C-alpha cells in the first residue's frame, strides 16, 4: 500500500534497525523521517541531498546523481514544513526497464541507533499495455495500440492475471474505470491518475466471467470507448469453509460447519503448504465475528503483527467479499519466501471458537 521507514521513536523503528526494500512498486510515495532543528548533534544525512545524489555500493560509496542512473519519470520533493518532523519523498515509475539499486546512510553521536538504507527497484514482473490516443510522442518504445486498433470506435481487451493497462488521455472523462456496465463490475486493485495517464492493475482473483468496466475518452471530436474484461480462471481457496450454505461462488479446501459441532471442543483447522515457488489463494469463510483483522493483521503463532512483515514479500494482494452474513476474507501470494513462517486467524460465533493455522515453507 505504502512504504514508510521511521527514523523517530514514535513508530516501530526508533532512532535516538535497518530499512531494506526489495520490491517493484509503482507510482508511490516514500516518506523519510529526519529531525534537524530539534537536535542534530553531528546527526547528518549521507550525502546531504540523498534523493538528488546517492551512492551505488556500500563497499565503495561514490557520488552519483539521480539523473545518471537510468530511472524514468521520477519526482523528488524535499519538504521541511511539518513542525514535528522533516520529510523526504520520491516517486517510482514502473517504466524502469532494468534492476537498479542504491544505498544511503545516517550517522549519530551518543551508539544512537545507526540505521542503513538499501533499496532496489525491479522491472515489473508482468507486462503493460499502452494506448496513447492523445497526440504525444514517447521514446519508451512500448506496446502502443493507437487510433487504428479500434473497431468502429470500440476496443475490447482481455487482461491476463496481473497485467497493467496504460491509457494516455489528457481529456477529463468522469467515472473512468469505476462504473461497470454489466450486472457485476471488474473490481480493480489499483486505479491511479497522473498527468491524466490512466493505470489499471488486474487482480488475480475474480468471481464471474462476465465482469467489465469502461472509460469513454474523447479525441479529435470522437468518442472512443475502452472495455476491460478478465481472462477467467477458477481457483480453489486454501482455508476452511465454516458457513453451512453450500450454494456459493467460492471453493474451499477444508470444510466444516461450525454451527453443528458441540460446545465442549474448540477444534482447529490446520493448513500447510510446501512448494518451491508459490501462486495460491488463502483465506476463510466465517459466518461469525472474525478477530483479529485478517489478513492484514494476522495473529502471531506460538501478539498482533502485520502480514507483509512476516512473509517479507511485497506481492501480497488482499481481497474481501460477503454473501449475506457470510464473511469471506482472503489474500493471494506470489514468489518464494525467505524463511518458513506461520500465523493464525480466529473465527467466533456465539459460544463457538475455531482457529485456522497456516504454515508456509521456504523450501
Amino acid at each position, epitope marked *: 500500500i505504502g512504504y514508510k521507514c521511521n527514523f523517530s521513536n514514535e513508530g516501530v523503528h526508533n532512532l535516538k534497525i535497518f530499512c531494506t526494500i526489495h520490491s517493484y512498486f509503482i507510482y508511490d510515495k516514500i516518506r523519510l523521517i529526519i529531525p534537524k532543528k530539534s537536535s542534530s548533534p553531528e546527526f547528518k544525512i549521507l550525502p546531504e541531498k540523498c534523493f538528488q545524489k546517492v551512492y551505488t555500493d556500500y563497499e565503495n560509496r561514490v557520488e552519483t546523481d539521480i539523473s545518471e542512473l537510468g530511472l524514468i519519470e521520477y519526482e523528488i520533493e524535499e519538504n521541511d514544513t511539518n513542525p514535528n518532523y522533516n520529510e523526504r519523498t520520491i516517486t517510482i515509475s514502473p517504466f524502469s526497464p532494468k534492476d537498479i539499486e542504491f544505498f544511503c546512510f545516517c550517522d549519530n553521536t551518543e551508539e544512537g541507533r545507526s540505521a542503513m538504507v538499501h533499496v532496489r527497484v525491479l522491472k515489473y514482473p508482468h507486462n503493460i499495455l499502452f494506448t496513447n490516443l492523445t497526440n504525444d510522442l514517447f521514446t519508451y518504445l512500448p506496446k502502443t495500440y493507437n*487510433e487504428s*486498433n479500434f*473497431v*468502429s470506435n470500440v*476496443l*475490447e481487451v*482481455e487482461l491476463n492475471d496481473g497485467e497493467l493497462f496504460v491509457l494516455a488521455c489528457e481529456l477529463i472523462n468522469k467515472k473512468c474505470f469505476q462504473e461497470g456496465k454489466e450486472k457485476a463490475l471488474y473490481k480493480s486493485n489499483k486505479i491511479i491518475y497522473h498527468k491524466n495517464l490512466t493505470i489499471f492493475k488486474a487482480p488475480f482473483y475474480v468471481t464471474s466471467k462476465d465482469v467489465n468496466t469502461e472509460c469513454t475518452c474523447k479525441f479529435k471530436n470522437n468518442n472512443y470507448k475502452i472495455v476491460l*474484461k*478478465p481472462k*477467467y480462471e477458477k481457483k480453489v481457496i486454501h482455508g476452511c469453509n465454516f458457513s453451512s450454505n453450500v450454494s456459493s461462488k467460492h471453493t474451499f479446501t477444508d470444510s466444516l460447519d461450525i454451527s453443528l459441532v458441540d460446545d465442549s471442543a474448540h477444534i482447529s483447522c490446520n493448513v500447510h503448504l510446501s512448494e518451491p515457488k508459490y501462486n495460491h489463494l488463502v483465506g476463510l469463510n466465517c459466518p461469525g465475528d472474525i478477530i483479529p483483522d485478517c489478513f492484514f493483521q494476522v495473529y502471531q503463532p506460538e501478539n498482533i503483527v502485520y502480514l507483509d512483515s512476516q512473509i517479507n514479500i511485497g506481492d501480497i494482494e488482499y481481497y474481501e467479499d460477503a454473501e449475506g452474513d457470510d464473511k469471506i476474507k482472503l489474500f493471494g501470494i506470489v514468489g518464494s519466501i525467505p524463511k518458513t513462517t506461520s500465523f493464525t486467524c480466529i473465527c467466533k460465533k456465539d459460544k463457538k471458537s475455531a482457529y485456522m493455522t497456516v504454515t508456509i515453507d521456504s523450501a
Partner: antibody
Framework: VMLVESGGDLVKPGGSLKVSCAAS????????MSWVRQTPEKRLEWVAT????????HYPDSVKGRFTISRDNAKNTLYLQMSSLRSEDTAMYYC????????????????WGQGTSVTVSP | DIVMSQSPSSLAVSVGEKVTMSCKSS????????????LAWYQQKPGQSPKLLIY???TRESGVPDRFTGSGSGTDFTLTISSVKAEDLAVYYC?????????FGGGTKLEIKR
C-alpha cells in the same frame, strides 16, 4: 496447420445440434476463431466469431440468441450450439481462423477448415 | 449492413490473358491514419475450402504466386491476374472487414477458353 470439423447431421425444423472444430499446428490461445456458412447458392455469410480469451463474442443480428459460440483452450476445440433451427439455416459450415498480424479485433481469415454439412429437412 | 456488389458473374477468358474483376462497396473502406484499405479477396477451388490471397486490398500473403495483383482504393476495387494456369478455375469472393458484420460478395466463376 489443420482444422477438423465434426457434427454434421440432419435435424427436424426447430431441433438443436452441437458441432466441434479441432485445431493443430499452432497455439490455440493466441488466435481468434470464427465460423462461416455457405447456402446452397454458394453464397458465403459470416455466422459467429469469438476472441482468444472467450470473453468478447459477436453474432449477426439474424441469428442472435439461438446460436452460441464457445471454445475450450485446454482441448484446442471450438464449439457452436445451434438452437431452434429453420429451413434457412441449412448450409455448409467452416471454422476459419482470424489473422492477428494487425492487433485489430476484426480481420480476415488466413486458414479455413474443410466443412461439415447440416440438414434441416423433416 | 455493408453491401458488396461483385460483377461480373461469369467470365470466359483465354489461357494466359489479363483478367480484371471488380468489387463494389456500399461505403468507404479506408482509415486515413493507417492509410490502408480494409478488404480481402479469397479463392475457393472446385470442391475445396476458400483460401486467403490478398489482404489490405493490395498486399499478398506468404504462399501466393506473383501472378496475382490486387488493386483499388476507397470503394472501387479491382483484381487482376496475368498468366492464367489451368486449375485456376475457382470462384473468387471479396470480403470486407471495416465494420461488423463482415459481408461477402457473390463470387465470380472462372470459365476457361476451350
Amino acid at each position: 496447420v489443420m482444422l477438423v470439423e465434426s457434427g454434421g447431421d440432419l435435424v427436424k425444423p426447430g431441433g438443436s445440434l452441437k458441432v466441434s472444430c479441432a485445431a493443430s499446428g499452432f497455439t490455440f490461445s493466441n488466435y481468434a476463431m470464427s465460423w462461416v456458412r455457405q447456402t446452397p447458392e454458394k453464397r458465403l455469410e459470416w455466422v459467429a466469431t469469438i476472441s482468444s480469451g472467450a470473453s468478447y463474442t459477436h453474432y449477426p443480428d439474424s441469428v442472435k440468441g439461438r446460436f452460441t459460440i464457445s471454445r475450450d483452450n485446454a482441448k484446442n476445440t471450438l464449439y457452436l450450439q445451434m438452437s431452434s433451427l429453420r429451413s434457412e439455416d441449412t448450409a455448409m459450415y467452416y471454422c476459419g481462423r482470424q489473422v492477428n498480424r494487425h492487433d485489430r479485433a476484426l480481420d480476415a481469415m488466413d486458414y479455413w477448415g474443410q466443412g461439415t454439412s447440416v440438414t434441416v429437412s423433416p | 449492413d455493408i453491401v458488396m456488389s461483385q460483377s461480373p458473374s461469369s467470365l470466359a477468358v483465354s489461357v494466359g490473358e489479363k483478367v480484371t474483376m471488380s468489387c463494389k462497396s456500399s461505403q468507404s473502406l479506408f482509415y486515413s491514419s493507417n492509410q490502408k484499405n480494409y478488404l480481402a479477396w479469397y479463392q475457393q477451388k472446385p470442391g475445396q475450402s476458400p483460401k486467403l490471397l490478398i489482404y489490405w486490398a493490395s498486399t499478398r500473403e506468404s504462399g501466393v504466386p506473383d501472378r496475382f495483383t490486387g488493386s483499388g482504393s476507397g470503394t472501387d476495387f479491382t483484381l487482376t491476374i496475368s498468366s492464367v494456369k489451368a486449375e485456376d478455375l475457382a470462384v473468387y469472393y471479396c470480403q470486407q472487414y471495416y465494420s461488423y458484420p463482415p459481408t461477402f460478395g457473390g463470387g465470380t466463376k472462372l470459365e476457361i477458353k476451350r
